[PDB]
Structure formats: structure tokens, C-alpha cells
Design a protein around this ligand. Structure first.
Ligand SMILES: *[C@@H]1O[C@H](CO)[C@@H](O)[C@H](O)[C@H]1NC(C)=O
Ligand SMILES: *[C@@H]1O[C@H](CO)[C@@H](O)[C@H](O)[C@H]1NC(C)=O
Ligand SMILES: *[C@@H]1O[C@H](CO)[C@@H](O)[C@H](O)[C@H]1NC(C)=O
Ligand SMILES: *[C@@H]1O[C@H](CO)[C@@H](O)[C@H](O)[C@H]1NC(C)=O
Ligand SMILES: *[C@@H]1O[C@H](CO)[C@@H](O)[C@H](O)[C@H]1NC(C)=O
Ligand SMILES: *[C@@H]1O[C@H](CO)[C@@H](O)[C@H](O)[C@H]1NC(C)=O
Ligand SMILES: *[C@@H]1O[C@H](CO)[C@@H](O)[C@H](O)[C@H]1NC(C)=O
Ligand SMILES: *[C@@H]1O[C@H](CO)[C@@H](O)[C@H](O)[C@H]1NC(C)=O
Ligand SMILES: *[C@@H]1O[C@H](CO)[C@@H](O)[C@H](O)[C@H]1NC(C)=O
Lengths: 122, 294, 98, 98, 49, 49
């Protein structure tokens, strides 16, 4: 709710956050266009030429399009790896507890939540 | 999401860190220090506390005889920890310092984008539009070198701050190995007092060690002697110190007052009563004679 | 009260529980050098290309920091091989631990 | 102070530092290691040396039957420290380098 | 117009200056009370003068 | 401004070194003065008394 004389909002770092539309006076949020890094997850080229791609910190309703597997992790969107419900020791760390590895499925890149070890009641 | 700067999520989630801390606590409580050196061997918890009392030089009968009092003192101390952290607004100030330095560096980096850097304007579109290609090119190069230097400064400060964080994490790992996975004999490592146990607790970007230590409490003055002369022989305590309450002589353990009759069982003989400076005259009981004669 | 034959010996004790707080990791950050300096100004990008390989080595430095943070956490907390569970009956001789 | 560069005095004066080190020495000489873990408990100094000898794996009678020799050796070594510091160039080299 | 270069320089030097006092505090202010040595300086023949 | 920035960076590196030294001195005060150490060569050459 801008005061009647105020035209554009601005943030802590003095970046324009909102505007008032001049024709019709409503307040419009401005959000930066989605960006991020792109990581390539591979087993060695000595094992396979298969690849998975991670778009870091990006919801992938905005990714323009490895494999058709598309998974949403807290690190970003993962393409070319399927999320299984097992847990193993971390092979390739993706982030937020998610790892990836090359496994029989015949072989493909899978994503999973890493196991911390085997339970043991003394 | 601002100006090409990104924050990556840590690999281990806070739930995973808490699972680690729970495994460490369960191992300590159910098996002592054994799970850190091999397989976890179970032991009753009071027996573990008796081992810890042995490790600081106090006999385990002291633990077994004061078990309920020791348990009560421990429970009160843990409750007081909870209360103390609920209060004293800046007790977690080291974690906050790390967070704040991180945030200040980033906000400074963003605010350096607006500085003219000696150029006509801080906006690339404006410099592009309002000047011819060559002059605008020179102005934009001034902006570029300014921003590049600012970014280089930020990265160098991050390297220095990460070196300090690595020193702190190395110390924390040493304390997890030596205070939580063992009982430490190093002084003031693992808190002030004689270390008994430590418990880890996970904190945002950090760890909290609760150190359980033994503190001697109510002192008494006694007279002491280095050796005792009996039959022209000098006797020294095998483990303990000779004390006197004014009339009678006992041998006690050095960290807890528990007087006992001076016997050939708790002393050893060496030499005669001539060389030791301060040797006193007393009798050393021999259990064998009365139980042999009777 | 130092004298040449007097000793002090404690007759009781107390159990202290004190607290130590240690930082372990910091925030992992990354920077797009181009998008920071230039911001979709193709003239800025073209000019920036002629300053050498500053961008790649800032990138490498920040990546090293980010990997080190996860290593810090792993070498503080993953000190148990197995995930131990406490028994369902929580009696430990009168010590509470709750 | 020359050109906008100034030097701030330390919070603890050298007399205060001397007071702390003197208290540490008084505690060690009069009580042993007890003042570092709780209240300070007086102990005669030869008995404290006997405890230290048990600490390194020697018995007490080795201290008490050689007490005069051990005290003389200690006194001579301390005097040698005094001399060795009087005359050696760059003995305090680390502080100078700082 | 150069920005906050000279607020962060001052902040960095202030951090160093506070750290120096912390260094001295942690090395020397370990003892809680000021212990005094007795007037009679006999310690079994050991000479601490 | 660049020369002053370099001075502050060198001061930060040197202060980190001094802090490591002062942490070691605090550890030695705790473990060699306020106790008797079993760590080899941590206090001196020989068996620490
Ligand atoms: C501008 O004119 C349009 C005509 O439809 C009107 O709806 C709108 O409210 C006007 N805005 C202002 C600020 O006068
Ligand atoms: C994008 O993904 C995030 C999950 O990280 C979700 O919260 C958000 O609603 C998604 N956006 C849309 C438009 O679905
Ligand atoms: C021992 O005696 C001295 C006086 O010589 C006194 O100051 C001190 O408080 C006494 N210690 C205890 C534990 O009562
Ligand atoms: C010393 O202890 C003995 C116990 O055997 C007791 O009989 C005696 O009365 C005590 N002497 C003094 C002076 O308290
Ligand atoms: C101890 O007893 C022996 C013989 O009974 C005697 O020669 C010596 O003087 C006594 N010592 C003291 C201090 O009374
Ligand atoms: C302790 O005894 C010694 C004799 O070896 C003597 O020189 C010293 O003065 C005595 N100390 C006191 C306080 O009586
Ligand atoms: C030791 O102190 C406790 C208080 O923590 C007290 O209740 C108990 O009576 C004391 N023990 C003796 C033997 O005085
Ligand atoms: C442990 O302490 C809590 C208070 O935090 C208390 O409610 C609980 O009863 C205690 N456990 C037992 C077994 O008494
Ligand atoms: C201690 O040594 C000094 C020489 O350093 C000497 O002058 C002094 O007399 C000695 N003290 C005693 C009590 O002998």
C-alpha cells in the first residue's frame, strides 16, 4: 500500500522491488528473471557417457526443456536422473541430503536421499 | 536472488546433523567410550560413571555410595543449562557473528554496484545511450575495473574468513573425538574442572558441547607428612597422602577425604628413617599378626 | 595458607555442566561474475572478455570455499560409523538426559 | 601519530599482565594443579614434586631421598636460564619479528 | 563516490584491535583469583626468586 | 585506496597468524602450567614436571 504520492518501492539494498502503474494506480511486484548455475553430474567417462544436469536454485516450471526424468530437489531441478526411494552412502553429492549414483535399473543415473549409516541398538 | 549472487544449500540437512548428534549421544550413554575405538560394548551407566571417576583419580566406591546425590546434581545442572540458554541474550554470539559477517559482506558487495567508481553514471544502459561508442566504452571500462576490484576484494575476505572457520571446525572435531568419544586428561580442554563426560548438541552452523566435570567442594586442613617411620623403616603411601587430624594418622586418597588406617597393604617400604626430611613416627598395622595369632 | 607441613583435602564435590559453542561452517555462496559486473549489457560482456581469466579464478576460489564447508561439517559430525539408538526404557541409574 | 595512522594502547597494562603471571606462579607454587580445577588447596612443595614424579612414572622415594640434589639441580638450571637470556643475540627473535 | 571502502577498512581494523585484547585475555586471565605467595619463602630448598 | 586496502589485507593475514600463536599459548598455559602434561614435547624436551 503505497502512500498516494509514492511511486516505486525499494528494498534494503536499494533495489527496486515494486512499482505503481502510472496509467492505472496499482502496485506491481518486480521479481528478477530466474537465473542460476548449471551443474553436470557424471560417472567417469571411463564407465559411461551418460549425464544428468542440475539447474541450481531453479524451479523447473521455468526450465525450457540426459533423460526426460525431471525432479525437483531443494537444490534445483534435476534432469536425467530418477529419484528412487532407497538410501545409500553418498556417491555424488547434489545437496540438501540428495546424492546421485550410477546403478542398475540396465544402468542409469539415480538420485536418492543419502543414508547416514546402518541402525544399531546397543 | 540478486545480481548473480547465489546461496547454495549445505549437503547435510539439519535433520541429518541432528541424527548424527543423536547417534553420538546414544553411543555415549549406552556404551561409554568403547564405541569410538571399535564395536560398541554395552555397560550400565553407573558403572560407566565409576570408570570416569577412576579416570580423574577418585575411587569408584565414592560414586557407588553417592550415586543418588551425583544423579541429582547432574539433573539440576542440566536444568540450569536449559535456563541459562533461555536467558543471557548473547550466549550464542559466535554463531551470530559468523552469520552477520557473511551478510555484511554480501550487502556491501551489492551496494558497491551503485558507486559511480569515478564514472559519469553507475548504469550501463545510460552510459551506452548518452555517449558515443568510444567515450562510453572508456566510461564502461572504468565501471568494469571498479566492480572487478570489488569482487576480488570480496573473494579474498571470504578466503580469510573460511580459513578461520576451518580452524574452528578442526578444534570442534578434536573436541568431539577427545571430549565426547573419550575422557580427556588435558586441563581446560573439555571445560573447567576434571572432565567426566561431554554431550554434543547441534546448532545452526555450529555445535554446542555440554561438558560434565567434577569440582572439589568442601576443604579441610590437615597435617601431613611425606613418610612414616616404623621399625626404623620409612613407609610411603602406595596411592594417597598421609594426613593427621591432630592426634591420629591416616592415609587418604588425594582428591577425596576418606581416611584409613595405615597398613602394610596401603603403604610401601623404602630405606630407613634417616634421609627423608619430615618423616614422622607412627605405627603401621600388619593384618597378618592378629589373624595369625588368634 | 601455605605452610611447610599443611595440606587441604576436599570432603565433598559438585557436578558442573558447562557449555562451549563452536562455529563449524558458513554459508556457501556463488557469484556469476558476468551477471554481477555486466547484467545483460553485451557491450560490458565484450569489454570484460579482455581482462583475462579473473572470472574463472574467482569462481574456483568460491567453489573451493563451498566444498570446504561441507567437509568441515562431515569431519565434525560424521564421527560415528553406525546410527545408534537409545533403549525404549530410559532409566540410566537416575540420570535423566531427557 | 603521523598521517592519520594512530596506535591504540592495549587494554591490559604491562603491570596488569605481570600481576596475572604472578598470581599464576603463586598458585602453582602454593597449591599445585588444584587451583586450575577448583579451589586452591595448599600442599607442601616437596610433596607436590613427589606427585609430579609419580606423574612421569617414578616413585615418591626417588624424590624424597634425593630432595636436596633435585633442589640444587633446579636452582642451577634456573640460574642458567638467567644467564642464557642475558647473552644470546636474537633469543627473543619471535617478538622482535612481530 | 567510491562507496563504502573506508567504512569496511575501519571495521576490519577495529576487528583486529578487539582480537588483540581477546588474545591477551585468553592467555593471561585464566586464574580467577589473585594468589599471593607467603612471606616466608621456604619451599623445601627450591629457590624461585 | 588500493594501497590502504592491501595494508588491511596483510594485517588480516598477520593477525590470523598471531591468533594461532596465542591459541597455542593459551593451550600451553592451561596444560603445562595449570597441570602436568603427558603429551610428548608439548612443554619441553624430557618428561614434563
Ligand atoms: C486513464 O484513462 C483511463 C481511461 O479508460 C482510465 O481508466 C484511468 O483511470 C485513467 N488513469 C488516470 C490516472 O487518470
Ligand atoms: C516452484 O517450485 C517451488 C519448490 O521449490 C514451489 O514452492 C513453487 O510453488 C513452484 N512454483 C510453481 C509456479 O509451481
Ligand atoms: C586452613 O587454615 C588457614 C589458616 O592457617 C585458613 O585461612 C583456611 O581457611 C583453612 N582452610 C580451611 C579449608 O578451613
Ligand atoms: C582424630 O580421629 C580419631 C579417629 O580414629 C578420633 O578418635 C580423634 O578424636 C580425632 N582427633 C581429633 C583431634 O579430632
Ligand atoms: C622416633 O622414634 C625413634 C625410636 O623410637 C627415635 O629415635 C626418634 O627420635 C623418634 N622421632 C621423633 C620425631 O620423635
Ligand atoms: C618448614 O621447615 C623448614 C625446615 O626444613 C624451615 O626452614 C621453614 O622455616 C619451615 N616453615 C615454617 C612455616 O615453619
Ligand atoms: C555435599 O554437598 C551436598 C550438596 O550438593 C550436600 O547435600 C551433602 O550433604 C554434602 N555432603 C557432605 C558429606 O557433607
Ligand atoms: C527429566 O526431566 C524432566 C524435566 O525436563 C522431567 O519432567 C522428567 O520427569 C525427568 N525424568 C524423570 C524420569 O523423572
Ligand atoms: C636464591 O638465589 C639467589 C641467586 O639467584 C640467591 O641470592 C638467594 O640467596 C637464593 N635464596 C635463598 C633463600 O637461598
Amino acid at each position: 500500500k503505497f502512500l498516494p504520492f509514492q511511486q516505486f518501492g525499494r528494498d534494503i539494498a536499494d533495489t527496486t522491488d515494486a512499482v505503481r502503474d502510472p496509467q492505472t494506480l496499482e502496485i506491481l511486484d518486480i521479481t528478477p528473471c530466474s537465473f542460476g548455475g548449471v551443474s553436470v553430474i557424471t560417472p567417469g567417462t571411463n564407465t559411461s557417457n551418460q549425464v544428468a544436469v542440475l539447474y541450481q536454485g531453479v524451479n523447473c516450471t521455468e526450465v525450457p526443456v540426459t533423460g526426460s526424468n525431471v525432479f525437483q530437489t531443494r537444490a534445483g531441478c534435476l534432469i536425467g536422473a530418477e529419484y528412487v526411494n532407497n538410501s545409500y552412502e553418498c556417491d555424488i553429492p547434489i545437496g540438501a541430503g540428495i546424492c546421485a549414483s550410477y546403478q542398475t535399473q540396465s544402468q542409469s543415473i539415480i538420485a536418492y536421499t543419502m543414508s547416514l549409516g546402518a541402525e544399531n541398538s546397543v | 536472488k540478486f545480481n548473480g549472487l547465489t546461496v547454495l544449500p549445505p549437503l547435510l540437512t539439519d535433520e541429518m546433523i541432528a541424527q548424527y548428534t543423536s547417534a553420538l549421544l546414544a553411543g555415549t550413554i549406552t556404551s561409554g567410550w568403547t564405541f569410538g575405538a571399535g564395536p560398541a560394548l554395552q555397560i550400565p551407566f553407573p558403572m560407566q560413571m565409576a570408570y570416569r571417576f577412576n579416570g580423574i583419580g577418585v575411587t569408584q566406591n565414592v560414586l557407588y555410595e553417592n550415586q543418588k546425590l551425583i544423579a541429582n546434581q547432574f539433573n539440576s545442572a542440566i536444568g540450569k543449562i536449559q535456563d541459562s540458554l533461555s536467558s543471557t541474550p548473547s550466549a550464542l554470539g559466535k554463531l551470530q557473528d559468523v552469520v552477520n559477517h557473511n551478510a555484511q559482506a554480501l550487502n556491501t558487495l551489492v551496494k558497491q554496484l551503485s558507486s559511480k567508481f569515478g564514472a559519469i553514471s553507475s548504469v550501463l544502459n545510460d552510459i551506452l545511450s548518452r555517449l558515443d561508442p568510444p567515450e562510453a566504452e572508456v566510461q564502461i571500462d572504468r565501471l568494469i575495473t571498479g566492480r572487478l576490484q570489488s569482487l576480488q576484494t570480496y573473494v579474498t575476505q571470504q578466503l580469510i574468513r573460511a580459513a578461520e572457520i576451518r580452524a574452528s571446525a578442526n578444534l570442534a572435531a578434536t573436541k568431539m573425538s577427545e571430549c565426547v568419544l573419550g575422557q580427556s586428561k588435558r586441563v581446560d580442554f573439555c571445560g573447567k574442572g576434571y572432565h567426566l563426560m561431554s554431550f554434543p548438541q547441534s546448532a545452526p552452523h555450529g555445535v554446542v558441547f555440554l561438558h560434565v566435570t567434577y569440582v572439589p567442594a568442601q576443604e579441610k586442613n590437615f597435617t601431613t607428612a611425606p613418610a612414616i617411620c616404623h621399625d626404623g623403616k620409612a613407609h610411603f603411601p602406595r596411592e594417597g597422602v598421609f594426613v593427621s587430624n591432630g592426634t591420629h594418622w591416616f592415609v587418604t586418597q588425594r582428591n577425596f577425604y576418606e581416611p584409613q588406617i595405615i597398613t602394610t597393604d596401603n603403604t610401601f617400604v623404602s630405606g630407613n628413617c634417616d634421609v627423608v626430611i619430615g618423616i614422622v613416627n607412627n605405627t603401621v598395622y600388619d593384618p597378618l599378626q592378629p589373624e595369625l595369632d588368634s | 595458607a601455605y605452610s611447610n607441613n599443611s595440606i587441604a583435602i576436599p570432603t565433598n564435590f559438585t557436578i558442573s555442566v558447562t557449555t562451549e559453542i563452536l562455529p563449524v561452517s558458513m554459508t556457501k555462496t556463488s557469484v556469476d561474475c558476468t551477471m554481477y559486473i555486466c547484467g545483460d549489457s553485451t557491450e560490458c560482456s565484450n569489454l570484460l572478455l579482455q581482462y583475462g581469466s579473473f572470472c574463472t579464478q574467482l569462481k574456483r576460489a568460491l567453489t573451493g570455499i563451498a566444498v570446504e564447508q561441507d567437509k568441515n561439517t562431515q569431519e565434525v559430525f560424521a564421527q560415528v560409523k553406525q546410527i545408534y539408538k537409545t533403549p525404549p526404557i530410559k532409566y540410566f541409574g537416575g540420570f535423566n538426559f531427557s
